[PDB]
Amino acid sequence: DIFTSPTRIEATLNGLYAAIKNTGTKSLMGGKSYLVFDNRGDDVINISNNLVTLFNTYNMNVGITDAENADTWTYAYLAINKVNTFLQSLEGAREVAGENYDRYVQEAKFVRALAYYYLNNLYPTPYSVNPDAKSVPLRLTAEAGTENNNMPRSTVKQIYEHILSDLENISALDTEVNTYTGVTHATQAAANMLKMRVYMAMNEWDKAITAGELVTGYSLPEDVTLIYKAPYFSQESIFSLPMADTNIPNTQQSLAEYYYDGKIMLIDTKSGIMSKPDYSLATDKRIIAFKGEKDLLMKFTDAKTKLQWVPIFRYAETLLDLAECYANKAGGEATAKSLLKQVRGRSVDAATDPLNIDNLSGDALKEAIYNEKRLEFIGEGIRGIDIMRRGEHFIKVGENETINVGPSDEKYTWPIPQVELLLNKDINK
Ligand SMILES: [Zn+2]
Ligand SMILES: [Zn+2]
Ligand SMILES: [Zn+2]
Ligand SMILES: [Zn+2]
Ligand SMILES: [Zn+2]
Ligand SMILES: [Zn+2]
Ligand SMILES: [Zn+2]
Ligand SMILES: [Zn+2]
Ligand SMILES: [Zn+2]
């Protein structure tokens, strides 16, 4: 814990990655807080009728005392404070760190950047609607006391701008493809993926392209099932949260526990992506692999071991994000189409595809990219972010009720939770 050796520095660094995943009793992006982003979306449905298993998130009804709100807040800020403390301790251990000092700093900053990024996609009105919308307190000092709980919220723009600062120097980060360490520590590719996501949320299509075009060395394997079974990564995998028998999430906190038995999450086959005929083709690899009997999503179904890794960034995302950027750029349509074709062609045979990608333009092209992203990333912690960053309504047409929540509605966002309101007297200043 005192940084007297490299192995002690690295143990604490690995604790940063654990802190954004889950603890022994609660979960963040390795469990329920990743599931939050699918529940906010419109491609799966939550039929649990149980607030303990994210029903209020799905129904766009999260209040100041909901468990998922308190937990996301508490564990994100715990992870952030661990990074702040790590960075301060590392400053006093420069010689012990030796040539690896910069990598350790830049990795720790990536973890803080990721934590803030997820908070910025729950609490504020999106930047695309209002860049001055209040988001969350920007806590950047190592704090062992309650001395500094009082702090105003920074804006959605300010949070993004700080994230960009934490990602500004990445040249000491690793660059390995298809190794445990390359997928489970932040690489330059991982940092650039986050930078791309941030710039897209700000409509900075050119800066997003520059970041995402730096992601090199990955590919799209022909088998779409590789990343959900041993060794839980492939040549497509950029960054994931790994699991081990001794650190899996507790009861009803893992991904697999939400999908495996049909009692919580199902595929929305009435109105979501897999209700659309071009995105439910019987010979699509993703439909064959993942569209289960009784509408179970078959990506994460090992609830016995819970060992499946949580995929944060993979290369199909790089391509579809780049496709979206180029579709928003004057003269970019030909490139957008070629990028879309790479991803769709991996799963859907072009010779018999009802979608003629070469003839898409304007709105039809954008919609094809949005729909491909919906099918490719069903269940992967993304859908509710794409809806929100674009300032779109969350529209969920069910048999007996329709959810329709837009940016002028209070329930578009999560409110600052009671855990914070009790301690922070400046929260509304
Ligand atoms: Zn010395
Ligand atoms: Zn240095
Ligand atoms: Zn900053
Ligand atoms: Zn390396
Ligand atoms: Zn590392
Ligand atoms: Zn069609
Ligand atoms: Zn192919
Ligand atoms: Zn209604
Ligand atoms: Zn509207």
C-alpha 232/C-alpha 311 separation (Å) is: 9
Domains of the chain, by residue range, sit at: 1-429
Query: Cα of 392 to ligand 9 centre, how many Å?
Result: 7
Question: Binding residue per annotation — 107?
Answer: yes
Closest CA to 153 of 428, 422, 414: 428
Question: Binding residue per annotation — 245?
Answer: no
Query: Cα of 120 to ligand 7 centre, how many Å?
Result: 36
The 3 state secondary structure assigned to 236-271 is CEEEEECCCCCCCCCCCCCHHHHHCCCCCEEECCCC
Q: Which tokens sit at 356?
A: 């003629």
Query: Cα of 201 to ligand 7 centre, how many Å?
Result: 31
Resolution in angstroms for this experimental structure?
A: 2.0
C-alpha 319/C-alpha 379 separation (Å) is: 18
Query: Cα of 32 to ligand 4 centre, how many Å?
Result: 31
Query: Of the ligands numbered here, which is closest to the C-alpha atom of 101?
Result: 2
- Cα-based distances in Å from 239 to 29, 122, 193, 245: 12, 22, 9, 20
CA angle at 418 for the pair 416 and 409, rounded to the nearest 5°: 40
Query: Of the ligands numbered here, which is closest to the C-alpha atom of 93?
Result: 1
Closest CA to 315 of 191, 407, 215, 383: 215
Question: Binding residue per annotation — 393?
Answer: yes
Query: Cα of 103 to ligand 5 centre, how many Å?
Result: 7
CB neighbours (10 Å) of residue 253?
A: 23
Question: Binding residue per annotation — 278?
Answer: yes
Q: Which tokens sit at 294?
A: 């009784």
Query: Of the ligands numbered here, which is closest to the C-alpha atom of 160?
Result: 3
Residue 381 DSSP label: S
Question: Binding residue per annotation — 333?
Answer: no
Query: Cα of 158 to ligand 7 centre, how many Å?
Result: 42
Question: Binding residue per annotation — 95?
Answer: yes
**Beta-ladder partners of 314:** 237
Contact 240, 311 (CB under 8 A): yes
Residue 230 burial class via C-beta count within 10 angstroms: exposed 0-12, middle 13-18, buried 19 and up: exposed
User: Which of 3.40.1080.10, 3.90.1150.10, 1.25.40.390, 3.30.1330.10 is the CATH number of 1-429?
Assistant: 1.25.40.390
Question: Which residues sit with Cβ closer than 5 angstroms to ligand 4, an ion?
Answer: 174, 176
CA angle at 206 for the pair 165 and 350, rounded to the nearest 5°: 120
Query: Cα of 185 to ligand 1 centre, how many Å?
Result: 29
C-alpha 34/C-alpha 27 separation (Å) is: 9
Query: Cα of 106 to ligand 5 centre, how many Å?
Result: 9
Query: Cα of 143 to ligand 3 centre, how many Å?
Result: 17
DSSP per residue, 79-130? HHHHHHHHHHHHHTTHHHHGGGHHHHHHHHHHHHHHHHHHHTTTSSPPTTT-
Question: Binding residue per annotation — 185?
Answer: yes
Query: Of the ligands numbered here, which is closest to the C-alpha atom of 16?
Result: 5
Query: Cα of 404 to ligand 9 centre, how many Å?
Result: 9
Contact 28, 247 (CB under 8 A): no
Query: Cα of 217 to ligand 2 centre, how many Å?
Result: 26
Sign of torsion over alpha carbons 225, 230, 232, 236: negative
Query: Of the ligands numbered here, which is closest to the C-alpha atom of 354?
Result: 6
Amino acid at 4: T
Query: Cα of 235 to ligand 6 centre, how many Å?
Result: 31
Question: Binding residue per annotation — 353?
Answer: no
Cα-flanking dihedrals φ and ψ of residue 249, to 5°? -70, 155
Q: Which tokens sit at 91?
A: 């400053």
Integer-rounded Cα Rg, in Å, for the chain is 21
Query: Cα of 33 to ligand 2 centre, how many Å?
Result: 34
Closest CA to 42 of 367, 258, 259, 268: 268
C-alpha 307/C-alpha 301 separation (Å) is: 10
Query: Of the ligands numbered here, which is closest to the C-alpha atom of 278?
Result: 6
Query: Cα of 97 to ligand 3 centre, how many Å?
Result: 24
